[PDB]
Design a binder for this molecule. Structure first.
Ligand code: SF4
Ligand code: CL
Ligand code: FE
Length: 178
């Protein structure tokens, strides 16, 4: 069984075309502000209710956001896709692997593998590094392949799923304004 970190509902929709027996873990203290976290969480809950998915919701709090910010802050000034995102994704995947170990899952993954903007080699390297640390296997898949991304777009539209326009953190929201 696999515990799959969930970044957002659109990428969850792409992912569920391929995976069938999973526990999902919505944990994203990198999403600010709270209103945006809740909007994204509610979209995930809408997908989970529609398809009867098993989703666990992680901690979101001032303390949790401060732990994330500490992990990325020395690279604030670098763009998206830089060492800042390496730190951010490792932070999220480390917590996911910890949860997988605690809940008895032998494997972990992330719906970030389905996101068209993310760097697959970077994510696979992070996942394998965390696998070696925790002893939970990282499951890699080109989750966009088999045309699954466009499959996720179609289901997002039909179900009326919120599709965000910035990665999630305050740095990415500023970079949106340019
Ligand atoms: S742009 Fe996305 S991956 Fe990069 S630090 Fe911000 S939330 Fe994390
Ligand atoms: Cl995302
Ligand atoms: Fe996503």
């Amino acid at each position: 069984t696999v515990l799959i970190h969930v970044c957002c509902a659109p990428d969850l929709l792409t992912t569920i075309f391929h995976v069938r027996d999973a526990e999902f873990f919505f944990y994203n203290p990198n999403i600010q502000p709270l209103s945006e976290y809740e909007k994204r969480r509610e979209a995930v809950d809408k997908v989970a209710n529609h398809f009867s998915l098993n989703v666990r919701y992680g901690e979101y709090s001032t303390e949790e956001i401060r732990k994330w910010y500490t992990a990325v802050k020395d690279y604030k000034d670098l763009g998206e896709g830089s060492k800042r995102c390496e730190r951010c994704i490792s932070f999220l995947l480390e917590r996911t692997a910890q949860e997988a170990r605690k809940r008895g899952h032998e494997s972990f993954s992330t719906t970030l593998l389905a996101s068209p903007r993310k760097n697959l080699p970077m994510i696979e390297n992070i996942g394998k590094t965390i696998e070696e640390k925790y002893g939970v296997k990282f499951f890699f898949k080109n989750f966009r392949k088999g045309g699954a991304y466009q499959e996720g777009v179609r289901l997002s539209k039909e179900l009326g799923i919120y599709r965000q326009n910035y990665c999630g953190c305050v740095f990415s929201l500023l970079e949106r304004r340019e």
